[PDB]
Design a protein around this ligand. Structure first.
Ligand SMILES: NC(=O)c1ccc[n+]([C@@H]2O[C@H](COP(=O)([O-])OP(=O)(O)OC[C@H]3O[C@@H](n4cnc5c(N)ncnc54)[C@H](OP(=O)(O)O)[C@@H]3O)[C@@H](O)[C@H]2O)c1
Ligand SMILES: O=C(O)COc1cc(F)ccc1C(=O)NCc1cccc(C(=O)O)c1
Ligand SMILES: O=C(O)COc1cc(F)ccc1C(=O)NCc1cccc(C(=O)O)c1
Length: 316
């Protein structure tokens, strides 16, 4: 397994990256430093995660130490929902660049297709708890993303949490200048995403799998919820390969030609999770893992279920 996948902008993207959602600000600097020391070259970030300054401290210190050159890193961030307006996209990108202490991003994603009213709140609500939408459509937001490429702020642009009809809308955009390079979506054995993955791959869009371990630290987890890391069937595949359950869960998307971004702040697990380039799952293992699909989706917001661009009413 090669370590990088070729994107439709001509750049190569490391297939394994470090996730940073929920990584506490007092722990994420050391997590990213350790990650870079043990071989990670791709970090997944977002303004909404509220920890980009601290991620940036780690990146800048490893660049200063000459542990890694900037060209060897692949740094990803995402445009939050309250910045979908034409006049706000550049400043949102610039704030992320400032915080990460970078002069460009390797990839910048529209975080969700649902735009919200701009303001200080990340989820502006009406009095009944519905999110307050923006009227800016995804195509105009895409044009604003294209400008960032042409201004040198980002090397590649993409999307996240877009359903196949929303991907198609961009691909069919009048005057489209740059195709999305990536669609970053939730993907794991309980939400295997075959239909959306095949659609994106057929169009040359690389898929990144988020929450590959099932996001057991998500704030809305319940004690009774399904658990990938504790599923005895997955544990059995791991034992047969002399690997951990997490290592199987990371290798699985890699063998589907996906990028994968497991999150950890635990130094031992950060190192463990990278040790996935020296074993193979068989075709039978892969099909068996795919068979565990239950359409169990962990990442969505109830406040958004009436937004016109809510992505998960469609089958895929
Ligand atoms: N685009 C989007 O809308 C979106 C949405 C969700 C996620 N994402 C991205 O995807 C990343 C990954 O998803 P996620 O954070 O939801 O969850 P995840 O990576 O599926 O799971 C993270 C959890 O697994 C634990 N863990 C990690 N390695 C482990 C191991 N070897 N053994 C046991 N437990 C282990 C972590 O614990 P410790 O940290 O305590 O070690 C943490 O509690 C995010 O951080 C974010 O960068 C993007
Ligand atoms: O979004 C991620 O990357 C990880 O989840 C979060 C992270 C945060 F820091 C703060 C909130 C979330 C969150 O609620 N996401 C779900 C979400 C967000 C926006 C729109 C929709 C929708 O359903 O339209 C769904
Ligand atoms: O709806 C949100 O903002 C975040 O997702 C939840 C929150 C819960 F309190 C309970 C379940 C979920 C959920 O199943 N999401 C998907």
């Amino acid at each position: 397994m090669a370590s990088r996948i070729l994107l439709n902008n001509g750049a190569k993207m490391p297939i394994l990256g470090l996730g940073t959602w929920k990584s506490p600000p007092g722990q994420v600097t050391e997590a990213v430093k350790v990650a870079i020391d043990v071989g990670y070259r791709h970090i997944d970030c977002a303004h909404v995660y509220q920890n980009e300054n601290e991620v940036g401290v780690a990146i800048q210190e490893k660049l200063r130490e000459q542990v890694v050159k900037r060209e060897e890193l692949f740094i990803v961030s995402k445009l939050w929902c309250t910045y979908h307006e034409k006049g706000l996209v550049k400043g949102a990108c610039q704030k992320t660049l400032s915080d990460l202490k970078l002069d460009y991003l390797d990839l910048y994603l529209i975080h969700w297709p649902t735009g919200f009213k701009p303001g200080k709140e990340f989820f502006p609500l009406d009095e009944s708890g519905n999110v307050v939408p923006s009227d800016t459509n995804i195509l105009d937001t895409w044009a604003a993303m294209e400008e960032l490429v042409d201004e040198g702020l980002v090397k590649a642009i993409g999307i996240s949490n877009f359903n196949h009809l929303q991907v198609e809308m961009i691909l069919n955009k009048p005057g489209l200048k740059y195709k999305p390079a990536v669609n970053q979506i939730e993907c794991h054995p309980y939400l295997t995403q075959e239909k959306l993955i095949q659609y994106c791959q057929s169009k040359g869009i690389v898929v990144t799998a988020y929450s590959p371990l099932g996001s057991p630290d998500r704030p809305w987890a319940k004690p009774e919820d399904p658990s990938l890391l504790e599923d005895p069937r997955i544990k059995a595949i791991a034992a047969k390969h002399n690997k951990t359950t997490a290592q199987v869960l990371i290798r699985f998307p890699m063998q589907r030609n996906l990028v994968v971004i497991p999150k950890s702040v635990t130094p031992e697990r950060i190192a463990e999770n990278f040790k996935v380039f020296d074993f193979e799952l068989s075709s039978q293992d892969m099909t068996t893992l795919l068979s565990y699909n239950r359409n169990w989706r962990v990442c969505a917001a109830a406040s958004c279920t009436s937004h016109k661009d809510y992505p998960f009413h469609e089958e895929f």
